[PDB]
Amino acid sequence: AEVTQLSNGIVVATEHNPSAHTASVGVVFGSGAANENPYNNGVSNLWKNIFLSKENSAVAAKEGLALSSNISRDFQSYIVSSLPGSTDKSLDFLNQSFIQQKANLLSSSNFEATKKSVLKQVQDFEENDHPNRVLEHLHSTAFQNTPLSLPTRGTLESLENLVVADLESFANNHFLNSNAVVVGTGNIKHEDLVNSIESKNLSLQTGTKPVLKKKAAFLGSEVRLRDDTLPKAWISLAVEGEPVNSPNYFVAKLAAQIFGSYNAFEPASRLQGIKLLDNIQEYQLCDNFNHFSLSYKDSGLWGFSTATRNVTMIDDLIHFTLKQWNRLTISVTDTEVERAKSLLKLQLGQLYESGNPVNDANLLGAEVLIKGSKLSLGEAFKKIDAITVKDVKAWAGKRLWDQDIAIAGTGQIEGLLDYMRIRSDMSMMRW
């Protein structure tokens, strides 16, 4: 495989997979949820859903073109998938959708129907999807009074104040030339995409997205959304992780991989090679957990989210999990590092080299927006092979051993104790 890249003010980056049967072509902007003030919050979600609106999707589906979109903290994307003989049709449709006009998408009826639909979706997310809203409050309290705290989904109190003028103001300030990368993944060649872009004009705008006054800074805090009428207790807990373009990126991900993920109901998940499972399976402390190493442009998060029904033994869950985290600084073995190497090679090659072209388009767009070129997977495997136990211990002493944490929880979290015992459990007192 190979990733090429060229420039004319726009950036054209591709992945010619000749074995695939489709071809995704779309623009990936460099603005995201982290580029909004807290009063126009959710305008990226509303651009996602006016791009995926019914009239626009119908006009797309007349030619056999499926639309896709994604709103992250750092990057938006607007991807159009088609057969590999219709890349010109997809480019001309994306041109007509964004560049040539926006007033037909931003009519009164389409905007009011879409605002109604996104208000319904945000309310449905707020009162029914519990582990994701725990993770969103974890971001909202780890990075508070700072633009990386804003949720990608938007809030009900802000999103019902947006009108068309704010949509157009965000479009003029963020849908720009240098801010964007046009991405073609799947079964298209790079030269075909560049010659077809130069065949059209496709000039988005003059350029220069506004620069944020405040950089992201981690802030140890907690938020407790206690709802006694829920059957479980969802809780995330994280420290300041590593951002992208850091030398400790793959080390932070391998540290997340050491303790892995778990599902107490699957039989092959209870037999993993984690030493936390011997403590966690005896009295059935949780139903599931997953360790995440989230990496953003300015900062990052490293921690775990979990859910449990054993609501009287939440503190034992947090206790054994954090003592296992303290094992990284002091006495992590060689076999755990080798196992995490093999599993992280596995899940990283599943992530970057799955068969779905829209996910490849999102990942390639994000990576060539942030760091200018895509690191191919072989050099990634060499960087994973270069990690030793001393690198993990040095990273854990830098980032894990007695550092501030951020906690978010909802449900029956009365069994979760104060902030100070969870904070003081980050250092063992025995080392």
Partner 1 sequence: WGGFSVSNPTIQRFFALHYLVPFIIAAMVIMHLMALHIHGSSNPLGITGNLDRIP
Q: Which of 95, 417, 423, 428 binds partner 1 (CB under 8 A)?
A: 417
Q: What mask of x and - would describe binding to partner 1 in positions 364 to 403, judged by CB under 8 A?
A: ----------------------------------------
Broken C–N links (> 2.5 Å) in the chain, after residues:
none
Task: Give the shortest CB-421-to-partner 1 separation in angstroms.
Answer: 7
Q: Residue 57: what residue type? A: S
Task: Give the shortest CB-423-to-partner 1 separation in angstroms.
Answer: 13
Q: Which stretch binds partner 1 (CB under 8 A): 15-23, 29-37, 175-183, 417-425?
A: 417-425
Length of the chain: 431
CA atoms within 13 A on the CB side of 402: 6
Does residue 360 contact residue 352 with C-beta atoms inside 8 Å?
Answer: yes
| 421 touches partner 1 (CB under 8 A) | yes
Which of 198/414 has CB closer to partner 1?
A: 414
Q: What mask of x and - would describe binding to partner 1 in positions 107 to 146, judged by CB under 8 A?
A: ----------------------------------------
Q: What angle do CA 320, 321, 326 make, to 5 degrees?
A: 95
| 223 touches partner 1 (CB under 8 A) | no
Which of 191/418 has CB closer to partner 1?
A: 418
Task: Give the shortest CB-417-to-partner 1 separation in angstroms.
Answer: 6
Residues in Cβ contact with 187 at an 8 Å cutoff, skipping those fewer than 6 apart: 16, 17, 18, 19, 20, 21, 22, 23, 84
Scan for tokens 């954090």, then name that residue: 322
Q: Which stretch binds partner 1 (CB under 8 A): 22-30, 44-52, 135-143, 415-423?
A: 415-423
| 244 touches partner 1 (CB under 8 A) | no
Q: Tokens for 57, please give them.
A: 């999707």
Which of 216/422 has CB closer to partner 1?
A: 422
User: What 8-state DSSP symbol labels residue 210?
Assistant: P
Which of 319/339 has CB closer to partner 1?
A: 319
Sign of CA dihedral 115, 117, 122, 123: positive
212-238 b/e with 16+ CB inside 10 Å = b?
eeeebebeebbbeeeeeeeebbbbbbb
Residues engaged in binding partner 1 (CB under 8 A): 417-418, 421
